[PDB]
Amino acid sequence: NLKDKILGVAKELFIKNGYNATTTGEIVKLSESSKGNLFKTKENLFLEILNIEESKWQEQWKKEQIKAKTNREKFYLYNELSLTTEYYYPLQNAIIEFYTEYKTNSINEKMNKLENKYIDAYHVIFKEGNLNGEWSINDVNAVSKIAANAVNGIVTFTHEQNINERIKLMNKFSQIFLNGLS
Amino acid sequence: NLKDKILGVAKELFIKNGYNATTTGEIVKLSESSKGNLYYHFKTKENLFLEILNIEESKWQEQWKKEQIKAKTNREKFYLYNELSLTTEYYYPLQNAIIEFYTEYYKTNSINEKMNKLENKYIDAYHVIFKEGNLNGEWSINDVNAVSKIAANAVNGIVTFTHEQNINERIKLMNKFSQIFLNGLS
């Protein structure tokens, strides 16, 4: 598929090099296509990929959260898998570089849904954890944001060391966090 | 000094135009130095930049030294250090050059080396907070080096990915996190 071949190449460059490094010229180069083809704007093509990868990851979580009976377990598992997936999280460096370039209102709103789809996972976990009586979170939305970000950090800023120690820290985190929720 | 001048001009160049667009040539001429001198002192731009970061680390460190006197107990120093990490970063000019630099060398073991001796330094701060926290029964951590790495990165995540809303809200979430976190300790 040509349209999904650009989506393919781009994603690659966006991960390897940054959002800046990757240029519309290259995307075309390694695609045997042409500017005339493209996906009008670059930030358009990019946010497209974010959506995809966001969805791919969210789905996998589902076809996977099954192995977790308690929401406490759900929390741990989500944080762990974050470290191993091949979806969304491998693009954080790129996302960051992008964000530092949030002025055009047609963005923070065009991403307001990407922001929530990313914290939802934790929303469900925390809320249903209240429904299931595993803890007592008043400010759910907050904790969800707090967690989504703390985790994204452990995942993003330690991507330079034994993948198994990361999983160890990450688990110690989940431990620490949930223990503090009451 | 001619070394210090190069570091200074370079820090400004990077800030005004970012890492990638800044050439060692600009740096040479504006610091009134020489390609030779710059090679001798830093070999590469990448190395030059690491040295600046290193210097900033020191400054941050000394700055934190003066500031923690505001927080009597370690529990407090924890709360404070994170707040500072979030607010100071909001208006740190080098941040942009740093981002650029990272997402450009975080796939090169070479630079990735020092990047760690550097990161580690950022982490010591927490290590001290937590160690001292023990010696005062503020808590009992037995895996300090870890909780420290945990904190340093969880907090950096909040700071770096929260970027998307009013500054007061971020500060609130950061403080909430510090509350939760210090709660699940012992």
CATH number at residue B109: 1.10.357.10
Query: Which residue matches tokens 């040295």?
Result: B51
Q: Is B115 in contact with A161 (CB distance < 8 Å)?
A: no
The rounded radius of gyration (Å) of the Cα atoms in chain B is 19
Contact call for A100 and B99, based on CB within 8 A: yes
Contact call for B100 and A139, based on CB within 8 A: no
d(CA B155, CA B164): 16
Query: Which residue matches tokens 């990077």?
Result: B14
Residue B44 gets the label, from left (phi > 0), alpha (psi -120 to 50) or beta, of beta
Resolution in A: 2.8
- Residue A140: is it exposed, middle or buried by C-beta count within 10 angstroms (0-12/13-18/19+)? middle
d(CA A10, CA B122): 34
Handedness of CA B129, B134, B140, B141 (dihedral sign): positive
Q: Which residues contact B179 (CB under 8 A, 6 or more apart)?
A: A180
Do A64 and A125 belong to one domain?
yes
d(CA B79, CA B176): 9
**Two tokens at A152?**
């994204």
Residues of A in contact with B163 (CB under 8 A): 99, 102
Total structural domains within chain A: 2
Handedness of CA A179, A122, A83, A59 (dihedral sign): positive
Residue A107 forms contact with B (CB below 8 Å)? no
d(CA B84, CA A14): 32
CATH number at residue B11: 1.10.10.60
**Two tokens at A121?**
């996972």
Q: Which residues contact A105 (CB under 8 A, 6 or more apart)?
A: none
Closest CA to A95 of A46, A150, A57, A146: A46
Do A38 and A116 belong to one domain?
no
Handedness of CA A95, A96, A97, A99 (dihedral sign): positive
- Distance between B157 CA and the closest CA of chain A, angstroms: 4
**Two tokens at B139?**
């808590």
Do A68 and A20 belong to one domain?
no
Do B109 and B121 belong to one domain?
yes
* Beta-carbon count within 10 A of B31 CB: 20
**Two tokens at A74?**
């759900």
Which of B149, B166, B170, B173 is best to mutate for the A interface (most A CBs within 10 A)? Answer: B149
Cα–chain-centroid distance for residue A29?
Answer: 28
The residue in chain A having the minimum alpha-carbon distance to the alpha carbon of residue B155 is A150
Following DSSP, what letter does each residue of B132-185 receive, concatenated?
HHHTTTS---S-HHHHHHHHHHHHHHHHHHH-SS-HHHHHHHHHHHHHHHHHTT
Do B100 and B146 belong to one domain?
yes
Closest CA to A96 of A111, A80, A106: A111
Do B96 and B111 belong to one domain?
yes
Query: Which residue matches tokens 């954890």?
Result: A129
Q: Is A147 in contact with A177 (CB distance < 8 Å)?
A: yes
Closest CA to B138 of A146, B147, B84: B147
Residues of A in contact with B91 (CB under 8 A): none
Do A151 and A168 belong to one domain?
yes
Do A31 and A115 belong to one domain?
no
Handedness of CA B172, A97, A87, A167 (dihedral sign): negative
Q: Is B161 in contact with A91 (CB distance < 8 Å)?
A: no
Do B67 and B139 belong to one domain?
yes
Query: What Cα–Cα distance (Å) separates residue B19 from each residue in B10, B13, B51, B97?
Result: 9, 8, 14, 5
Q: Which residues contact A59 (CB under 8 A, 6 or more apart)?
A: none
Do A73 and A160 belong to one domain?
yes
Query: What Cα–Cα distance (Å) separates residue A115 from each residue in A121, B131, B138?
Result: 11, 36, 36
**Two tokens at B173?**
């979430």
The C-alpha angle with vertex B177 and arms to A165 and B174, in degrees rounded to 5, equals: 115
d(CA A80, CA B145): 20
Do B60 and B43 belong to one domain?
no
Q: Which residues contact B165 (CB under 8 A, 6 or more apart)?
A: none
Q: Is A125 in contact with A74 (CB distance < 8 Å)?
A: yes
User: Within the 33-52 window of chain B, which residues sit less than 8 Å (CB to CB) from chain A?
Assistant: none
Residues of A in contact with B116 (CB under 8 A): 160
Cα–chain-centroid distance for residue B148?
Answer: 15
Query: Which residue matches tokens 């000094």?
Result: B1
- Residue A35: is it exposed, middle or buried by C-beta count within 10 angstroms (0-12/13-18/19+)? exposed
Do B22 and B80 belong to one domain?
no
Task: Find the domain containing B166 and state its range.
Answer: 50-186
**Two tokens at B121?**
């330094």
Amino acid at B122: Y
SS (H, E, C) B16-31: HHHHHHCCHHHHHHHC
